[PDB]
Amino acid sequence: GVSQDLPAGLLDDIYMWATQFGDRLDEIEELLTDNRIWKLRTVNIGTVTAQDALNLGLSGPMLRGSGIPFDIRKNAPYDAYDKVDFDVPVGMNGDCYDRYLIRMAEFRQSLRIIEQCCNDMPAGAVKVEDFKINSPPRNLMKEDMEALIHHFLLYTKGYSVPPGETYTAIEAPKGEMGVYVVSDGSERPYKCKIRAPGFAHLGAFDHIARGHFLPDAVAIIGTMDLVFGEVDR
Amino acid sequence: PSWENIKDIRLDPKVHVDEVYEPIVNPADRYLQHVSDLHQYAKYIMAALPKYIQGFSVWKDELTLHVAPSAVIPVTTFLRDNTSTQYKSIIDITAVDYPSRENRFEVVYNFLSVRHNSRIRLKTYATEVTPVPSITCLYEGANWFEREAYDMYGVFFEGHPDLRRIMTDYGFEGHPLRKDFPLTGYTEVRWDEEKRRVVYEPLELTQAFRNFSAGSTAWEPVGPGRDDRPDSFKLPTPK
Amino acid sequence: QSVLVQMREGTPIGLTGIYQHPNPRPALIALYEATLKELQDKHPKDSVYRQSIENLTAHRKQIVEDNEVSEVIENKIGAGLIEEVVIQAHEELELAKKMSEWKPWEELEEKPLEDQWVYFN
Amino acid sequence: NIYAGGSAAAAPPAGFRIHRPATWEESEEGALSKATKYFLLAEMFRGLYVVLEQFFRAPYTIYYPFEKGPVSPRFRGEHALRRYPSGEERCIACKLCEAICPALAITIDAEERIDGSRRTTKYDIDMTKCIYCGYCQESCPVDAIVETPNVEYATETREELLYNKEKLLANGDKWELELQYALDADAPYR
Amino acid sequence: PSVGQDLPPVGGYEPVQWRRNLPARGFRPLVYLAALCGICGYGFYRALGGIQERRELKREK
Amino acid sequence: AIIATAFAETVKFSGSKQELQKRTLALYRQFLRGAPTFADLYEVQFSIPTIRTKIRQEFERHRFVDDLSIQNVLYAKGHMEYQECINAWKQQAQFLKYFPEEDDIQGRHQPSNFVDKFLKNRA
Amino acid sequence: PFDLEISTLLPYVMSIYLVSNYGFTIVLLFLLILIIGFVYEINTNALKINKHNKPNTDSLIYK
Amino acid sequence: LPGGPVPVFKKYTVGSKGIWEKLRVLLAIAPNRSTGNPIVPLYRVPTPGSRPEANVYQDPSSYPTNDIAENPYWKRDHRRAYPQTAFFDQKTVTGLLELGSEATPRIADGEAGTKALANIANGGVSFTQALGKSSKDVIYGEVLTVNGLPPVAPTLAPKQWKIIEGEAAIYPKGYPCRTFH
Ligand SMILES: CCCCCCCCCCCCCCCCCC(=O)OC[C@H](COP(=O)(O)OCCN)OC(=O)CCCCCCCCCCCCCCCCC
Ligand SMILES: CCCCCCCCCCCC(=O)OC[C@H](COP(=O)(O)OCC[N+](C)(C)C)OC(=O)CCCCCCCCCCC
Ligand SMILES: CCCCCCCCCCCC(=O)OC[C@H](COP(=O)(O)OCC[N+](C)(C)C)OC(=O)CCCCCCCCCCC
Ligand code: SF4
Numbered sequence A: 001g002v003s004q005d006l007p008a009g010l011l012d013d014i015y016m017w018a019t020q021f022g023d024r025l026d027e028i029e030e031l032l033t034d035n036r037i038w039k040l041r042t043v044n045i046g047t048v049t050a051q052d053a054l055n056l057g058l059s060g061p062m063l064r065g066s067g068i069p070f071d072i073r074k075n076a077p078y079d080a081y082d083k084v085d086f087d088v089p090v091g092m093n094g095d096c097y098d099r100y101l102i103r104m105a106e107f108r109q110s111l112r113i114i115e116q117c118c119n120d121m122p123a124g125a126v127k128v129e130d131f132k133i134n135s136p137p138r139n140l141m142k143e144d145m146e147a148l149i150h151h152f153l154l155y156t157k158g159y160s161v162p163p164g165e166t167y168t169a170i171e172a173p174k175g176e177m178g179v180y181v182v183s184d185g186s187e188r189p190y191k192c193k194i195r196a197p198g199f200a201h202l203g204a205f206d207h208i209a210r211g212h213f214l215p216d217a218v219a220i221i222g223t224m225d226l227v228f229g230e231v232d233r
Numbered sequence B: 001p002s003w004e005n006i007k008d009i010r011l012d013p014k015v016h017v018d019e020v021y022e023p024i025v026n027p028a029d030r031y032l033q034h035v036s037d038l039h040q041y042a043k044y045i046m047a048a049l050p051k052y053i054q055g056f057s058v059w060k061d062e063l064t065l066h067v068a069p070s071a072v073i074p075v076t077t078f079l080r081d082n083t084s085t086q087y088k089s090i091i092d093i094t095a096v097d098y099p100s101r102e103n104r105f106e107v108v109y110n111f112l113s114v115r116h117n118s119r120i121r122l123k124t125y126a127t128e129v130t131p132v133p134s135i136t137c138l139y140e141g142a143n144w145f146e147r148e149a150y151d152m153y154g155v156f157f158e159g160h161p162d163l164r165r166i167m168t169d170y171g172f173e174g175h176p177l178r179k180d181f182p183l184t185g186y187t188e189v190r191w192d193e194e195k196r197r198v199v200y201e202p203l204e205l206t207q208a209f210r211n212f213s214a215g216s217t218a219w220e221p222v223g224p225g226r227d228d229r230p231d232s233f234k235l236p237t238p239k
Numbered sequence C: 001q002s003v004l005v006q007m008r009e010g011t012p013i014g015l016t017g018i019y020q021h022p023n024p025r026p027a028l029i030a031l032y033e034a035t036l037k038e039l040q041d042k043h044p045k046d047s048v049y050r051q052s053i054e055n056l057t058a059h060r061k062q063i064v065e066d067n068e069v070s071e072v073i074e075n076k077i078g079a080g081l082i083e084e085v086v087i088q089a090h091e092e093l094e095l096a097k098k099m100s101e102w103k104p105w106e107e108l109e110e111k112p113l114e115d116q117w118v119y120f121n
Numbered sequence D: 001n002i003y004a005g006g007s008a009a010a011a012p013p014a015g016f017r018i019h020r021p022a023t024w025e026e027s028e029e030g031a032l033s034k035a036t037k038y039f040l041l042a043e044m045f046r047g048l049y050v051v052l053e054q055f056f057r058a059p060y061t062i063y064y065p066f067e068k069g070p071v072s073p074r075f076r077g078e079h080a081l082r083r084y085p086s087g088e089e090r091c092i093a094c095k096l097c098e099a100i101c102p103a104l105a106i107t108i109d110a111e112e113r114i115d116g117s118r119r120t121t122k123y124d125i126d127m128t129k130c131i132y133c134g135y136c137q138e139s140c141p142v143d144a145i146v147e148t149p150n151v152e153y154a155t156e157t158r159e160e161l162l163y164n165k166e167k168l169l170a171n172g173d174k175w176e177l178e179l180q181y182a183l184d185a186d187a188p189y190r
Numbered sequence E: 001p002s003v004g005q006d007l008p009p010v011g012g013y014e015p016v017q018w019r020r021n022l023p024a025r026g027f028r029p030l031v032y033l034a035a036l037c038g039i040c041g042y043g044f045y046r047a048l049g050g051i052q053e054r055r056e057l058k059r060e061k
Numbered sequence F: 001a002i003i004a005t006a007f008a009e010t011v012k013f014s015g016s017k018q019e020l021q022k023r024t025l026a027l028y029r030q031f032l033r034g035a036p037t038f039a040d041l042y043e044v045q046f047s048i049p050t051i052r053t054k055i056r057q058e059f060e061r062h063r064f065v066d067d068l069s070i071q072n073v074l075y076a077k078g079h080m081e082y083q084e085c086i087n088a089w090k091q092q093a094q095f096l097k098y099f100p101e102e103d104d105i106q107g108r109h110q111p112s113n114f115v116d117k118f119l120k121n122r123a
Numbered sequence G: 001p002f003d004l005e006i007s008t009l010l011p012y013v014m015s016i017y018l019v020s021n022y023g024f025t026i027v028l029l030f031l032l033i034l035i036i037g038f039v040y041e042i043n044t045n046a047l048k049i050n051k052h053n054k055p056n057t058d059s060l061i062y063k
Numbered sequence H: 001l002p003g004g005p006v007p008v009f010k011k012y013t014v015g016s017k018g019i020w021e022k023l024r025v026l027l028a029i030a031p032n033r034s035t036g037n038p039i040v041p042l043y044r045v046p047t048p049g050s051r052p053e054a055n056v057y058q059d060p061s062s063y064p065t066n067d068i069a070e071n072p073y074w075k076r077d078h079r080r081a082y083p084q085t086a087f088f089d090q091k092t093v094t095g096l097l098e099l100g101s102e103a104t105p106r107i108a109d110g111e112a113g114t115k116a117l118a119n120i121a122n123g124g125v126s127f128t129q130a131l132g133k134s135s136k137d138v139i140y141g142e143v144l145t146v147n148g149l150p151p152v153a154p155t156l157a158p159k160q161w162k163i164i165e166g167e168a169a170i171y172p173k174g175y176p177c178r179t180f181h
């Protein structure tokens, strides 16, 4: 679940932030979206067709740059994205310009999530209910014998995961990011593997950057958005 | 109409519950119907390619086809091209070594059909010396993935342009993600002042690595668990 | 004779790389008939593979010959646009051509060992 | 109905067909209107006027050693071994902070002292391999080690950056008035 | 039970702005072109007048 | 990545021992043709026949290997090594991994006997 | 050759009063003769560096 | 238009006062734009180490879990109620094709049905032999769809798209990006 509960007055503060971030973003939008220099630098740069966007394994803003309506939080939803209403931007030409426009719109959609989630926040527990996978609170483990036993064991040994394998993918803002973890049945993972989006984006670099000029080899790095914690680990 | 006369929201009547009501339910119960669907789909695929599909496993919302190594290119082709499957996007391929098996590595392949919104896994096997055939013939995004599975595990992909190491040191001898390879490795780096270069030396630590895996449980922590195999896909008891 | 499957320039379309394809349903029908002829030619009729792609291309061919507008059929077909559907029918045609060289209705040639495929109970 | 096979109810949506892009002759703007915006750089000037507006507003810069930025009490900086009221070391050598530490920074040796009480002989943190996860503070039942919000302790040698028991007891001495403020606001939330 | 948490308001917050606020500003482009031609033509009036005066001054000298 | 690197080879496994012997001798020829560009490229102290004797010595390490698959894995590792060395990707500090013996004398007191191994308990 | 034209205008614009109505037309003819070589240059697309790889426009035919 | 332009007195930002605001509504692109700087008496007062809500906080709970007396843990444990991977070889699929199912038992002779199980468990039959032996409506019942079609690759929750194209869209027409919902 979550590490601990929110502080005492933060829900009233994210609202106060969002009220002004709505215009702080339109302001950044104005000197780039219809800048003719920013336009000419990225209009037919980095074009990927929708059929080889699948063959390269591209996802997120690069797959939706090419016209394909696919994102995980609508298609295979998780973590209370069912309960929150929003729409999705998808470009039409496979270029750096539509990959820019869908980010500038995903800003807006994320702000829509934030205000819907501040309005619809319920009460209740913030961690999972049982003390065999995460710790009791310190009010309890200092007087409860069971809870002191569970607190002592979840930190020395840890909890045990049942034996199995899973590939779980969510939508990072870079793209589809997944993890393939093999559980022995022990308290250490037998195997973990991170599928980073930017690994497949940088592997796809040769396929796109053929026949571009040298300056337009730099504007295409900034659309696959390589942070390099992703690409090598 | 001012920023002086704007209302505060800290002074407000807020939500307050006496008591929270959350019903308890098994998370595996929401999958079951789709899991049954997945079973039927897999029983079709094995019936469609009996020469090439040794097995399958359905855990919970996740399908795995168990396929032999010389059987991988006829299966992936099928998964790319059949109108029912259409597993266009390569997602993630890698290896896992089980040193207790004869064929040490198993090589897993993850595919996404963005049409039908479905994932599939393909498992083959490989020894340290014997290859797996490469699917970079079909997928141009696969080869880097194959290449990473080369460097961390030593698994080969026959028919691969530019198989070499990636995300490791150039003169690195060893395959790191491998149970005989130690954690801290074999060598270390320092600046030799005499030769005015970095030298690579056998490894030595100022604090030795202390694993606390010695000291695990002596009681087996989880049961066998229940099944979500449907009654359609298990053998009938006689009478 | 020769058939067109994918326009790579022309009137633009919602997807990148694909363009609007002139006269889709003759190319569609001819692709379907090539698939059914190839498949009844070179596969044994006990095959589950052959039976299913027979019934599948027969169902799609029936839908394409019945209705006459294009976006009545692309909602009844259930795949994407008909440029996509023609690409898919071409793809199942070349899949069906490869399957008779690979011959996958046989028994499996590579049986696993039993130390193979055990996962920590 | 019944669908085909390769066919779900995920048909194309009503309106997934594009409209054909407009030619030059089917446009509402005149050539004169369109090319006045071309040669007189209209939206370039609009984006120019944006940052001109921004010249005339208040900057955000705070002056760092004279004005510090945000603090929550949850924040984590250097380490401190606290003491009881009436001065007792609190560290009952339970090895939990060592067992949980994700980067193996803690090392402890523990011996029974003359009182028969259980204390650490040796406590040590490598601050070069510390990662500030706070698990060592979350784990301690006595709440003996904490994270003070000090981040301003930057050193010049590695030897200075290896904190034994004595440096951490001096830290828990020095920051104790502050750690009162931190744990008065954190302890219910823990 | 739940006591002392951060909770939302009894009626919720009022909606923030997530649409694009890019209103089309300025005159029509033909207004700017007409003003440009008017300014430039008046400048040509004064400039060509001054050249003719300077020619008459040169005649005098 | 449809275009591959310059000194690439599609990795291909031989069912015959002799065609792998053909490929091994071709690889030795590639290495020894490239010894002078290795001497220029990595700014080395010594001269080219020491690169050539190291290439020959690294091949006489693996001469009496019988099993054909192990010789295939050996040939693939060797071609990857050639491709790294020829393309100037390896640097001088890892090019001189191959020469631990040549750079310096590491000092006195080389233990040979049991007793001078014993006096420093193999150190 | 364009730079040599720009400094060929430089004797004219100093003599502009003395050759009034006559050197005006000679300069008009001079400028237009060089405008024709310029429209040669931009009709030929001479100063472009153009990218060698297309989307490969050629369609997908079969059999 | 539910999330449309709001004026800048509902935006919690320091703004301006006096006739300087009458000057900046004439000198603006959109007059309903904030200045960026949050209102100091509103934004983060009281500071987070000084909160009256911290002394009243108690740890939260749901009812059928914090319940003191009626629940035992083995009824609401689900880590030990995990399902396992149903691993199927080819000979158990031959067994499912020839003997039947627990929904569909094609087995009489229970005493002899054990030894009818046995030879397939030994590998008497093979799988393509089972596909040839088996009926056409068992092929169209259990292997294929009841209409004879291949089963489509299953998804858990299908997503039907609905393109928003009017002025409820995020970009007006002429921009190369579309809202898909
Ligand atoms: C109908 C009108 C009148 C008719 C008479 C004919 C013309 C008379 C007026 C002449 C004045 C011309 C001024 C310069 C013309 C610039 C024209 C232009 O926009 O260049 C286009 C060029 C690329 O052309 P293209 O590929 O077709 O794409 C254009 C997108 N539509 O784009 C480019 O290559 C880059 C564009 C660079 C623009 C300059 C960028 C930096 C300089 C900014 C200067 C701003 C000055 C403000 C200073 C304020 C001081 C207080
Ligand atoms: C020093 C010599 C150089 C001077 C600069 C060049 C001349 C100016 C030409 C462009 C401006 C103009 O006059 O544009 C006039 C137009 C009028 O548009 P509207 O009718 O309000 O649109 C209505 C659209 N609604 C319905 C959406 C609202 O925009 C403006 O008022 C915007 C403010 C322009 C401020 C001028 C910038 C300089 C600030 C200092 C004040 C002098
Ligand atoms: C190719 C574009 C042709 C445009 C034609 C426009 C017709 C305007 C006629 C008005 C006549 C007038 O009012 O002119 C009067 C002015 C001043 O004259 P003055 O010194 O007071 O006269 C003294 C006569 N004495 C000596 C006998 C006493 O003289 C001019 O030169 C200015 C002409 C007006 C502006 C022309 C702008 C041309 C810009 C072209 C850039 C492309
Ligand atoms: S500081 Fe805490 S966790 Fe560490 S040994 Fe002392 S009591 Fe245990």
Ligand code: SF4
Pocket (backbone or CB within 6 Å): D097, D100, D101, D102, D103, D104, D105, D106, D125, D129, D130, D131, D132, D133, D134, D135, D136, D137
């Ligand atoms: S903060 Fe984390 S890394 Fe640092 S000593 Fe505590 S548990 Fe270890």
